């Protein structure tokens, strides 16, 4: 089969599509192009041909095979934010990515994933006893900021554990994400005209400098440590690999940065959306509380509990299905292949529109929020909220642990109410790199009233 999509109007076809991505935002443009043309179609970002694909088969094929273990985006943009051939998230150098990923994978599983369940709970407890730092005079909690702070404290105490300014770093991380999102697919032209991107360059420097102070302190503690054997962690493993031949200071420094931003970027907005759903679905809220009563009671949550929390697990999955944050995935073809019907050349960019896929493929009631969608065991080839395979989410397992831990410890303690008739559907969302609340609007706050 030849490839669907707009006409290559002798050099205008590319300019409209890129411009449309810039104008609409990546996610809404993907959804536009998939709805107009097929669920498998072609478009251009800068020069290069990029396939925007919703079909479950193609998705599975792509994530399954090792010759798609790359992403893409502006080299100038990725250099600007420090992700050009450096971290793992947008590290598109195959070999350098291969050697860095294992550090992340170790830290996000085994004993650290077990530690995480109590670390995550104790952190939120701390922040729920200090709700004055986040609550209004009118009782309005800034949930986005609350979550970001506990997510950061969580990430810090597990992976780095150096004292830091939560509030400041959370703002800096937000700044870094805006820059990443802004520059990821900007054309080379953009990067010439300097007073159009110095803005972003500063956000990156703010965060990078802040983290350099922390890794600096972390370095000094490692040098003077007696029992280096016992107290290992993600940041230390990296630093010791650099002390062997294995890694570069620059790369270490970006990996530590990337581990600290991950959850604040994504967990916070996911749990935010999840809380607005609990607020407007009392049917489900009850089921979850009943489960928490049965399973946990008034004991501190423990690793053994999380597998038993079945209703919440379905809620989490249905929330990510219905209202995702990470609704699309960027990949690149490293070898030629046939994919469903169509040929895909080496170097061809790919955007997997997993948000659309979860409304077109397997589920009984795709366009409404119900746990009926997860009453029958969902095959993992029709529902990839995290992705899978050799480049799937490195946090995918621990993320689920973390989300259960915070939803338990919060709902245990508080009823959550939304302002006005607001719901996830009515919130004004930006749909660019990720899918998240437009924070220049308001009515995003919530109210926390106790239980008993």
Binding residues: 265, 330, 393
Which of ligand TES, ligand HEM, none binds 399 (CB below 5-8 Å, type-dependent)? Answer: ligand HEM
Our CB check for ligand HEM shows the closer of 83 and 447 to be: 83
Which of ligand HEM, ligand TES, none binds 265 (CB below 5-8 Å, type-dependent)? Answer: ligand TES
Binding site as annotated, residues for substrate:
265, 330
Measured CA distances, 429 to 143, 171, 264, 329 (Å): 16, 20, 18, 18
In the block, tokens 């802004």 appear at: 182
Our CB check for ligand HEM shows the closer of 16 and 96 to be: 96
> CA gyration radius for the chain?
22
Residue 299: burial class (beta carbons within 10 Å; 0-12, 13-18, 19+): exposed
Least distance in angstroms from the C-beta of 269 to ligand HEM: 8
Binding site as annotated, residues for heme:
393
Which of ligand TES, ligand HEM, none binds 88 (CB below 5-8 Å, type-dependent)? Answer: ligand HEM
Which of ligand TES, ligand HEM, none binds 18 (CB below 5-8 Å, type-dependent)? Answer: none
Measured CA distances, 270 to 253, 273, 447 (Å): 27, 5, 18
Least distance in angstroms from the C-beta of 261 to ligand TES: 5
Which of ligand TES, ligand HEM, none binds 104 (CB below 5-8 Å, type-dependent)? Answer: ligand HEM
Residues 6+ apart with CB under 8 A from 252: 215, 238, 239, 241, 242
At CA 185, angle to CA 205 and CA 336, rounded to 5? 125
Summarize as ranges the residues that interact with ligand TES (CB under 6 A).
Answer: 71, 89, 261-262, 265-266, 326, 328-330, 433-434
Give the rounded distance of the alpha carbon of 345 from its chain centre: 28
Least distance in angstroms from the C-beta of 45 to ligand TES: 13
Least distance in angstroms from the C-beta of 70 to ligand HEM: 9
Least distance in angstroms from the C-beta of 247 to ligand HEM: 16
Least distance in angstroms from the C-beta of 181 to ligand TES: 8
Summarize as ranges the residues that interact with ligand HEM (CB under 6 A).
Answer: 63, 88-89, 101, 104, 108, 259, 262-263, 266-267, 270, 320, 325-326, 329, 385-387, 391-395, 399
Our CB check for ligand TES shows the closer of 39 and 265 to be: 265
Q: How many CB atoms lie within 10 A of CB 105?
A: 13
d(CA 110, CA 43): 41
Question: Helices (DSSP H) in 280-395: which residue ranges?
Answer: 282-295, 303-308, 310-322, 354-360
d(CA 27, CA 89): 18
Which of ligand HEM, ligand TES, none binds 39 (CB below 5-8 Å, type-dependent)? Answer: none
């Amino acid at each position: 089969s030849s490839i669907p999509g707009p006409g290559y109007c002798m050099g205008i076809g590319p300019l409209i599509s890129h411009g449309r991505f810039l104008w609409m935002g990546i996610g809404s443009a993907c959804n536009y192009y998939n709805r107009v043309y097929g669920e498998f179609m072609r478009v251009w970002i800068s020069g290069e041909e990029t396939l925007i694909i919703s079909k479950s088969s193609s998705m599975f094929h792509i994530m399954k095979h090792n010759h798609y273990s790359s992403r893409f985006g502006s080299k100038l943009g990725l250099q600007c934010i420090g992700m050009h051939e450096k971290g793992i998230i947008f590290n598109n150098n195959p070999e350098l990515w291969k050697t860095t990923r294992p550090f992340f994978m170790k830290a996000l599983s085994g004993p650290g994933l077990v530690r995480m369940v109590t670390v995550c709970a104790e952190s939120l407890k701390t922040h729920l006893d200090r709700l004055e730092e986040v609550t209004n005079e009118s009782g309005y909690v800034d949930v986005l900021t609350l979550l970001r702070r506990v997510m950061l404290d969580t990430s810090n105490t597990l992976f780095l554990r150096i004292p830091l300014d939560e509030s400041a770093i959370v703002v800096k991380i937000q700044g870094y994400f805006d820059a990443w999102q802004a520059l990821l697919i900007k054309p080379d032209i953009f990067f010439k005209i300097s007073w159009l991107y110095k803005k972003y360059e500063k956000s990156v420097k703010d965060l990078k400098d802040a983290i350099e102070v922390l890794i600096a302190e972390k370095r000094r503690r490692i040098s003077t440590e007696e029992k280096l054997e016992e107290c290992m962690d993600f940041a230390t493993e990296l630093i010791l690999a650099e002390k062997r031949g294995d890694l570069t200071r620059e790369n270490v420094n970006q990996c530590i940065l990337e581990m600290l931003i991950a959850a604040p970027d994504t967990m916070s907005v996911s749990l935010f959306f999840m809380l607005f759903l609990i607020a407007k679905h009392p049917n489900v809220e009850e089921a979850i509380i009943k489960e928490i009563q049965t399973v946990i009671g008034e004991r501190d949550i423990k690793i053994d509990d999380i597998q038993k929390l079945k209703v919440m697990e379905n809620f989490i999955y249905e929330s990510m299905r219905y209202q995702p944050v990470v609704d699309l995935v960027m990949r690149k073809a490293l070898e030629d292949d046939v994919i469903d019907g169509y040929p895909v050349k080496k170097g061809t960019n790919i955007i997997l529109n997993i948000g659309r896929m979860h409304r077109l493929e397997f589920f009984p009631k795709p366009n409404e929020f119900t746990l009926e969608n997860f009453a029958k065991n969902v095959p993992y080839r029709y529902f990839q909220p995290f992705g899978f395979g050799p480049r799937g989410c490195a946090g995918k397992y621990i993320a689920m642990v973390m989300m259960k831990a915070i939803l338990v410890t919060l709902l245990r303690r508080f009823h959550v109410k939304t302002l006005q008739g607001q719901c996830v559907e009515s919130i004004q969302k930006i749909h660019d790199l990720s899918l998240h609340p437009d924070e220049t609007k308001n009515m995003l706050e919530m109210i926390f009233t106790p239980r008993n």
